[PDB]
């Protein structure tokens, strides 16, 4: 759910 980690 972040920019760096899309799945996060």
Backbone as JSON Lines, residues from 0, in Angstrom:
{"i":0,"aa":"X","n":[0.79,-1.19,0.0],"ca":[0.0,0.0,0.0],"c":[0.83,1.26,0.0]}
{"i":1,"aa":"X","n":[2.11,1.13,-0.27],"ca":[2.98,2.27,-0.31],"c":[3.43,2.49,-1.75]}
{"i":2,"aa":"X","n":[4.25,3.5,-1.97],"ca":[4.75,3.79,-3.31],"c":[5.9,2.84,-3.62]}
{"i":3,"aa":"X","n":[6.72,2.58,-2.61],"ca":[7.88,1.72,-2.77],"c":[7.46,0.27,-2.88]}
{"i":4,"aa":"X","n":[6.48,-0.11,-2.08],"ca":[5.97,-1.45,-2.12],"c":[4.48,-1.38,-2.38]}
{"i":5,"aa":"X","n":[4.12,-1.54,-3.62],"ca":[2.74,-1.43,-4.07],"c":[1.81,-2.4,-3.36]}
{"i":6,"aa":"X","n":[2.29,-3.61,-3.07],"ca":[1.44,-4.6,-2.41],"c":[1.27,-4.3,-0.93]}
{"i":7,"aa":"X","n":[2.06,-3.38,-0.43],"ca":[2.01,-3.02,0.97],"c":[1.21,-1.74,1.13]}
